[PDB]
Design a protein around this motif. Structure first.
Motif, mmCIF file in Angstrom:
data_model
loop_
_atom_site.group_PDB
_atom_site.id
_atom_site.type_symbol
_atom_site.label_atom_id
_atom_site.label_comp_id
_atom_site.label_asym_id
_atom_site.label_seq_id
_atom_site.Cartn_x
_atom_site.Cartn_y
_atom_site.Cartn_z
ATOM 1 N N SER A 176 -0.907 3.189 -10.488
ATOM 2 C CA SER A 176 -1.303 3.252 -9.089
ATOM 3 C C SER A 176 -1.715 1.896 -8.536
ATOM 4 O O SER A 176 -1.813 1.744 -7.313
ATOM 5 N N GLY A 177 -1.960 0.914 -9.399
ATOM 6 C CA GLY A 177 -2.257 -0.442 -8.994
ATOM 7 C C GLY A 177 -1.067 -1.375 -8.991
ATOM 8 O O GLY A 177 -1.254 -2.590 -8.846
ATOM 9 N N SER A 178 0.146 -0.855 -9.150
ATOM 10 C CA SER A 178 1.333 -1.696 -9.168
ATOM 11 C C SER A 178 1.611 -2.265 -7.785
ATOM 12 O O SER A 178 1.060 -1.800 -6.782
ATOM 13 N N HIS A 179 2.463 -3.286 -7.736
ATOM 14 C CA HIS A 179 2.837 -3.897 -6.468
ATOM 15 C C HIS A 179 3.497 -2.874 -5.553
ATOM 16 O O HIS A 179 4.393 -2.135 -5.969
ATOM 17 N N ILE A 180 3.045 -2.838 -4.305
ATOM 18 C CA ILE A 180 3.595 -1.913 -3.321
ATOM 19 C C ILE A 180 4.961 -2.417 -2.881
ATOM 20 O O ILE A 180 5.140 -3.609 -2.606
ATOM 21 N N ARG A 181 5.933 -1.513 -2.828
ATOM 22 C CA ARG A 181 7.296 -1.835 -2.441
ATOM 23 C C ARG A 181 7.666 -1.090 -1.165
ATOM 24 O O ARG A 181 7.074 -0.058 -0.835
ATOM 25 N N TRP A 182 8.642 -1.636 -0.440
ATOM 26 C CA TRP A 182 9.045 -1.051 0.832
ATOM 27 C C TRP A 182 9.551 0.373 0.635
ATOM 28 O O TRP A 182 10.328 0.655 -0.281
ATOM 29 N N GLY A 183 9.103 1.273 1.507
ATOM 30 C CA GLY A 183 9.496 2.664 1.434
ATOM 31 C C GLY A 183 8.709 3.509 0.459
ATOM 32 O O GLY A 183 9.017 4.696 0.306
ATOM 33 N N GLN A 184 7.703 2.941 -0.203
ATOM 34 C CA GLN A 184 6.890 3.705 -1.144
ATOM 35 C C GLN A 184 5.833 4.501 -0.390
ATOM 36 O O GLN A 184 5.051 3.915 0.368
ATOM 37 N N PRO A 185 5.785 5.823 -0.558
ATOM 38 C CA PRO A 185 4.772 6.621 0.146
ATOM 39 C C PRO A 185 3.366 6.260 -0.313
ATOM 40 O O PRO A 185 3.138 5.963 -1.488
ATOM 41 N N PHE A 186 2.422 6.290 0.625
ATOM 42 C CA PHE A 186 1.024 6.035 0.321
ATOM 43 C C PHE A 186 0.148 6.762 1.332
ATOM 44 O O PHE A 186 0.610 7.198 2.389
ATOM 45 N N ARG A 187 -1.130 6.889 0.986
ATOM 46 C CA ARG A 187 -2.128 7.520 1.837
ATOM 47 C C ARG A 187 -3.143 6.477 2.280
ATOM 48 O O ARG A 187 -3.683 5.740 1.450
ATOM 49 N N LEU A 188 -3.398 6.420 3.584
ATOM 50 C CA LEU A 188 -4.354 5.483 4.158
ATOM 51 C C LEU A 188 -5.690 6.191 4.340
ATOM 52 O O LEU A 188 -5.791 7.145 5.118
ATOM 53 N N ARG A 189 -6.708 5.722 3.627
ATOM 54 C CA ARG A 189 -8.039 6.306 3.679
ATOM 55 C C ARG A 189 -9.002 5.365 4.388
ATOM 56 O O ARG A 189 -9.083 4.179 4.061
ATOM 57 N N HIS A 190 -9.731 5.903 5.361
ATOM 58 C CA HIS A 190 -10.784 5.147 6.025
ATOM 59 C C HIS A 190 -11.991 5.082 5.099
ATOM 60 O O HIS A 190 -12.541 6.119 4.715
ATOM 61 N N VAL A 191 -12.399 3.865 4.734
ATOM 62 C CA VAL A 191 -13.387 3.702 3.670
ATOM 63 C C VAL A 191 -14.753 4.214 4.111
ATOM 64 O O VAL A 191 -15.422 4.949 3.374
ATOM 65 N N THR A 192 -15.191 3.837 5.314
ATOM 66 C CA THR A 192 -16.536 4.196 5.753
ATOM 67 C C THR A 192 -16.683 5.687 6.031
ATOM 68 O O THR A 192 -17.711 6.276 5.678
ATOM 69 N N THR A 193 -15.683 6.313 6.651
ATOM 70 C CA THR A 193 -15.761 7.733 6.969
ATOM 71 C C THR A 193 -15.213 8.629 5.867
ATOM 72 O O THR A 193 -15.570 9.811 5.820
ATOM 73 N N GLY A 194 -14.367 8.103 4.985
ATOM 74 C CA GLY A 194 -13.837 8.890 3.892
ATOM 75 C C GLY A 194 -12.740 9.860 4.259
ATOM 76 O O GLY A 194 -12.422 10.741 3.453
ATOM 77 N N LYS A 195 -12.147 9.728 5.440
ATOM 78 C CA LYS A 195 -11.110 10.639 5.892
ATOM 79 C C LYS A 195 -9.757 9.940 5.899
ATOM 80 O O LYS A 195 -9.654 8.747 6.196
ATOM 81 N N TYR A 196 -8.716 10.698 5.569
ATOM 82 C CA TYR A 196 -7.380 10.146 5.401
ATOM 83 C C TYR A 196 -6.597 10.241 6.702
ATOM 84 O O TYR A 196 -6.666 11.249 7.411
ATOM 85 N N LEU A 197 -5.853 9.181 7.010
ATOM 86 C CA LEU A 197 -5.018 9.172 8.202
ATOM 87 C C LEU A 197 -3.937 10.238 8.083
ATOM 88 O O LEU A 197 -3.338 10.416 7.018
ATOM 89 N N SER A 198 -3.688 10.948 9.180
ATOM 90 C CA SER A 198 -2.755 12.063 9.176
ATOM 91 C C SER A 198 -2.145 12.222 10.559
ATOM 92 O O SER A 198 -2.656 11.700 11.553
ATOM 93 N N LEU A 199 -1.038 12.958 10.610
ATOM 94 C CA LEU A 199 -0.342 13.260 11.854
ATOM 95 C C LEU A 199 -0.489 14.750 12.140
ATOM 96 O O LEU A 199 -0.165 15.587 11.291
ATOM 97 N N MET A 200 -0.976 15.077 13.333
ATOM 98 C CA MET A 200 -1.113 16.464 13.743
ATOM 99 C C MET A 200 0.249 17.054 14.102
ATOM 100 O O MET A 200 1.265 16.357 14.172
ATOM 101 N N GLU A 201 0.258 18.369 14.323
ATOM 102 C CA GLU A 201 1.483 19.039 14.748
ATOM 103 C C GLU A 201 1.914 18.584 16.136
ATOM 104 O O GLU A 201 3.114 18.548 16.432
ATOM 105 N N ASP A 202 0.959 18.234 16.996
ATOM 106 C CA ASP A 202 1.252 17.793 18.359
ATOM 107 C C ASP A 202 1.579 16.300 18.454
ATOM 108 O O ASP A 202 1.479 15.754 19.564
ATOM 109 N N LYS A 203 1.947 15.659 17.342
ATOM 110 C CA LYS A 203 2.330 14.245 17.328
ATOM 111 C C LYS A 203 1.159 13.360 17.758
ATOM 112 O O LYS A 203 1.271 12.539 18.671
ATOM 113 N N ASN A 204 0.015 13.546 17.104
ATOM 114 C CA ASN A 204 -1.184 12.762 17.367
ATOM 115 C C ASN A 204 -1.875 12.443 16.050
ATOM 116 O O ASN A 204 -2.029 13.322 15.196
#
Lengths: 374, 394
Positions: free
Chosen positions: B251-279
Motif C-alpha cells: 500500500s506504500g508503493s509508488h502511485i501510478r496513473w489510473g490506480q484507484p485510491f481513497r481520499l481521506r480528510h485527515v482532520t475530520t476523518g471522512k472520505y471523499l465521495s460522490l453522491m447520487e445527485d453528482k455532488n
C-alpha cells in the motif's frame, strides 16, 4: 530441568487442571472447596454402582492439585540466583506468580481441618485419610508460598499467622490428649507443622521485631507452640524443631510481650523434669539478652521497664528454680543447664528490689492447672 | 528471485478469523497517541469499510540474535528465524510490547499487548518462529510466511482471542499464525514522487487554491461539503488529504496513473465521495464504499482510458511527481471529472462534470511529517472530546 518443565507446562496448559486452564476456571481455592464437597458427597466420591478398589475422587483431586503446586514450587528458582539478578530466574518466578495467585494459596491454607472426636463408648472416631483434606495438601501450598512468593513483610506474616497457621497450631494443641495423641490426624498434623510451618516461622524470625500492635496474636502463638512442645506423642526431631522455632521467635520478640508466657513458665519449670529443659534455654537466653530491662531503673530506652509484676514473676521463678534444684537429686546435665538460667535471673533482678507484699490478688492457679493447663 | 523481509521495512501484521464460519482478515492496530492498548482492524471488508493502515504499519528496526540481545540487555539486516526483532509503530514512533497488565479477557494467564516509549528491557523485543516445516531456525524469512511471535518478557505467543464477543489481541500461551505483509521499504522510495499513504494538498488554479472543507463551524454537518479555497488554508490543517490505496499489501508503493485510491480528510476523518445527485460529500468510514469513494489520477483529460494494468508487487515505478506533475481526478465508476463550479476567500464550489474545464489540472504538494502528525492528533482528540461532551450532555 525446572526451566524446561515450566516451559513445557505453560506450552500445554491442559496439565494445570480444569481449575487452572485459565478459561471458565474457578481457581485453586474454589477447586479445593469443590473437592471437599465431592468428598462429603457419597455419589461422586465413590463408584456408586477397601481402598485399592475404591478411589475417593475428591481426595484424588486434592492430591493432584497439591502435587501440581508442589512441583511448581520446587521448579521455582533458588533465591541466590534471584538475588544475583538472573533474568531467566526472574522470568520463571514471574511466570509461576502469574500462574498461581497469592490469595488462593492463603485461602487454601486458611481452609480448616476436621478433628477426631471421642464418643460415648470411649472409642475415638477418626475420618479416613483416603477421603478428605489432609495436611500433605497444606504442605505443598506452604512450600509454593515460601519458594515463590516469600514472606518478607511483617503485615503479610501476621495476616498469614492469623488466618491459616494459628488455627492449625491450636487444633494440634487441642489434639494432645492421651487418647487422641496416637490418632492418624494428630500425627499427620504434627508432622506437617514441624516440617513446614514452624521452620517457616523460624526463618521469618526477624520480621517479628516490631509487633507491638499485634500483641495478642504473638502471645497466643507462643502459648500454643509451648503447649504443643509440652505434648507427649512428639518425636525427637519434632521436639527439636519446636525448640529452635520458639528460641528464634522469643529472641527477636520484645521483652514486654513474653510476660504472659513467663507466667506459665514459672509454674512448670520448677518441676525440673525433662520437659523443663527448653524453658531453661528460653529463660537463659531471654534474661541474658534483656537484663537491662529489669535491672536498670530506666531500662531500655524504647522498651522501657518492668511493671513490678514481671519483677515478682522473676523473683518467684528464681526462688522456685533454686529450691527445686536444691531438693533435686544431682543430675549432671540438668544441673549444668539450670545454673546459667539461675545466674541470668539473679543478674536481671535488681539487688534492691522490694518483694511485693501486695501479691497479685487472685493468682491463676485455679484457672491454670497442672494438668490440661486450663 | 524472491524478496526477504529485512530491517528498516514497513509491514502490517495480519491474522485470520473464522467467526461464524466466515474467514476474515484482520490487522494488528494501535492508536499510539492516547489509548496505549492494541486493537484489531478488519481488512476483509475493504470493499465496504476502509481499513486504517496508518495505525497498522510497523517498522522493523533491529533483528538481533537471542544471545546478542542478552548481552546488550546485560550491558539493512535480513531477518532470520530465531532472531528477536523490535517493531516500531510508524505513526506513534512507539514499540510493541507486553504491558504485563491484563484486562482479564476470561484468561488470568494472558497479558495485554500495547506500545512502550522506551526500548529498554525485554518486553519490547519479540522472537519470530517458523509455522511450516519448510522453514527452520536460521533460515531467511520469506515475505509470504506465517510467523509466530514470542515475547521475551512473558514467553507468551501473540494470540488472537476468540473467547470474548469482540476479537482481541493479547499474549497467551496459545499460539496464533501471523502473516507479514510488506507495505513499503524506505530505501527503494524515490524522493519527490507520490507514494501510497501520504498526506498531501490538492492545489488548483492560478492562485494555487487548495481543495478543502469549510472551516470549523462547530458543525460536522456543515463541515461535510467540499470547495476550493486559497490563502492561509494552504498552510492550515483542514486542507490535508491522505491518499489510501484499495490494496492492503504494498500500500506504500509508488502511485501510478489510473490506480484507484481513497481520499481521506485527515482532520475530520471522512472520505471523499460522490453522491447520487453528482455532488461531492464527505462520508463516514462505515459508509465509505468502493462504488462512491474510488478516484484515480490521470495524466490528461483524454477520453481513451488507461484500461486495465496489472498490480506489481514491490515499490513499482515512480510516475506522479510532486509539484511538477499535473493531475486530473476521475471517478472510477461514473467516469466524472473533478472540476470547479466556476461561481464566485474565493469559496468557489467543486463539482464533477463529465467534460469539465480545460483548466482543471491540479498540482500536488507533500505535507510535512510534523504537520500530518498534528492533524491526526487533532482528529483523535476531537473524536474523543465529542464523545465525552455527548456523554456529559446525555
Amino acid at each position: 530441568n525446572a526451566n524446561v518443565v515450566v516451559r513445557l507446562l505453560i506450552r500445554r496448559p491442559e496439565c494445570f487442571g480444569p481449575a487452572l486452564r485459565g478459561e471458565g476456571g474457578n481457581g485453586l481455592l474454589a477447586a479445593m472447596e469443590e473437592a471437599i464437597k465431592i468428598a462429603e458427597d457419597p455419589s461422586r466420591d465413590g463408584p456408586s454402582p477397601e481402598e485399592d478398589d475404591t478411589i475417593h475422587m475428591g481426595n484424588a483431586i486434592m492430591t493432584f492439585y497439591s502435587a501440581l503446586i508442589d512441583l511448581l514450587g520446587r521448579c521455582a528458582p533458588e533465591m541466590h540466583l534471584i538475588h544475583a539478578g538472573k533474568g531467566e530466574a526472574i522470568r520463571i518466578r514471574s511466570i509461576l506468580r502469574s500462574l498461581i495467585p497469592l490469595g488462593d494459596l492463603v485461602g487454601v491454607i486458611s481452609i480448616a481441618f476436621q478433628m477426631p472426636t471421642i464418643a460415648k463408648d470411649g472409642n475415638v472416631v477418626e475420618p479416613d485419610m483416603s477421603a478428605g483434606f489432609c495436611p500433605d495438601h497444606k504442605a505443598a501450598m506452604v512450600l509454593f508460598l515460601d519458594r515463590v512468593y516469600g514472606i518478607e513483610v511483617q503485615d503479610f506474616l501476621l495476616h498469614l499467622l492469623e488466618v491459616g497457621f494459628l488455627p492449625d497450631l491450636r487444633a494440634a494443641a487441642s489434639l494432645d490428649t492421651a487418647a487422641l495423641s496416637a490418632t492418624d490426624m494428630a500425627l499427620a498434623l504434627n508432622r506437617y507443622l514441624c516440617t513446614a510451618v514452624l521452620p517457616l516461622l523460624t526463618r521469618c524470625a526477624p520480621l517479628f521485631a516490631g509487633t507491638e500492635h499485634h500483641a495478642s496474636l504473638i502471645d497466643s502463638l507462643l502459648h500454643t507452640v509451648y503447649r504443643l512442645s509440652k505434648g507427649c506423642s512428639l518425636t525427637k526431631a519434632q521436639r527439636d524443631s519446636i525448640e529452635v522455632c520458639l528460641l528464634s521467635i522469643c529472641g527477636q520478640l520484645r521483652p514486654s510481650m513474653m510476660q504472659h508466657l513467663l507466667r506459665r513458665l514459672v509454674f512448670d519449670v520448677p518441676l525440673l523434669n525433662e520437659h523443663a529443659k527448653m524453658p531453661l534455654k528460653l529463660l537463659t537466653n531471654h534474661y541474658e539478652r534483656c537484663w537491662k530491662y529489669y535491672c536498670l531503673p530506666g531500662g531500655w530506652g524504647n522498651f522501657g521497664a518492668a511493671s513490678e509484676e514481671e519483677l515478682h514473676l522473676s523473683r518467684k521463678l528464681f526462688w522456685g528454680i533454686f529450691d527445686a534444684l536444691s531438693q533435686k537429686k544431682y543430675e549432671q546435665e540438668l544441673f549444668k543447664l539450670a545454673l546459667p538460667c539461675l545466674s541470668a535471673v539473679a543478674g536481671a533482678l535488681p539487688p534492691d528490689y522490694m518483694e511485693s507484699n501486695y501479691v497479685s490478688m487472685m493468682e491463676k492457679q485455679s484457672s491454670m492447672d497442672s494438668e490440661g493447663n486450663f | 528471485e524472491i524478496q526477504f523481509l529485512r530491517t528498516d521495512d514497513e509491514v502490517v501484521l495480519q491474522c485470520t478469523a473464522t467467526i461464524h464460519k466466515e474467514q476474515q482478515k484482520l490487522c494488528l492496530a494501535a492508536e499510539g497517541f492516547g489509548n496505549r492498548l492494541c486493537f484489531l482492524e478488519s481488512t476483509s471488508n475493504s470493499k465496504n469499510v476502509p481499513p486504517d493502515l496508518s495505525i497498522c504499519t510497523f517498522v522493523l528496526e533491529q533483528s538481533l540474535s537471542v544471545r546478542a540481545l542478552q548481552e546488550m540487555l546485560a550491558n539493512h539486516r535480513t531477518l532470520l528465524y530465531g532472531h528477536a526483532i523490535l517493531l516500531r509503530h510508524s505513526y506513534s514512533g512507539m514499540y510493541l510490547c507486553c504491558l504485563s497488565t491484563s484486562r482479564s479477557s476470561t484468561d488470568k494467564l494472558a497479558f495485554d499487548v500495547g506500545l512502550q516509549e522506551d526500548t529498554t528491557g525485554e518486553a519490547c523485543w519479540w522472537t519470530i518462529h517458523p509455522a511450516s516445516k519448510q522453514r527452520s531456525e536460521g533460515e531467511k524469512v520469506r515475505v509470504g510466511d506465517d510467523l509466530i511471535l514470542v515475547s521475551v518478557s512473558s514467553e507468551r505467543y501473540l494470540h488472537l482471542s476468540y473467547g470474548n464477543g469482540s476479537l482481541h489481541v493479547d499474549a497467551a500461551f496459545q499460539q496464533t499464525l501471523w502473516s507479514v505483509a510488506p507495505i513499503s521499504s524506505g530505501s527503494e522510495a524515490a524522493q519527490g514522487y507520490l507514494i501510497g499513504g501520504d498526506v498531501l494538498r490538492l492545489l488548483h488554479g492560478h492562485m494555487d487554491e487548495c481543495l478543502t472543507v469549510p472551516s470549523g463551524e462547530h458543525g460536522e454537518e456543515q463541515r461535510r461539503t467540499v470547495h476550493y479555497e486559497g490563502g492561509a488554508v494552504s498552510v492550515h490543517a483542514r486542507s490535508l488529504w491522505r491518499l489510501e490505496t484499495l490494496r492492503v499489501a504494498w500500500s506504500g508503493s509508488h502511485i501510478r496513473w489510473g490506480q484507484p485510491f481513497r481520499l481521506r480528510h485527515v482532520t475530520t476523518g471522512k472520505y471523499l465521495s460522490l453522491m447520487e445527485d453528482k455532488n461531492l460529500l464527505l462520508m463516514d468510514k462505515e459508509k465509505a464504499d468502493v462504488k462512491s469513494t474510488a478516484f484515480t489520477f490521470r495524466s490528461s483529460k483524454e477520453k481513451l482510458d488507461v484500461g486495465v494494468r496489472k498490480e506489481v508487487d514491490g515499490m513499482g515505478t515512480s510516475e506522479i511527481k510532486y509539484g511538477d506533475s499535473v493531475c486530473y481526478i476521475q471517478h472510477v465508476d461514473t467516469g466524472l471529472w473533478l472540476t470547479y463550479q466556476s461561481v464566485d476567500s474565493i469559496q468557489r464550489k467543486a463539482i464533477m462534470h463529465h467534460e469539465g474545464h480545460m483548466d482543471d489540472g491540479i498540482s500536488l504538494s507533500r505535507s510535512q511529517h510534523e504537520e500530518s502528525r498534528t492533524a491526526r492528533v487533532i482528529q483523535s482528540t476531537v473524536f474523543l472530546f465529542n464523545r465525552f461532551i455527548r456523554g456529559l450532555d446525555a
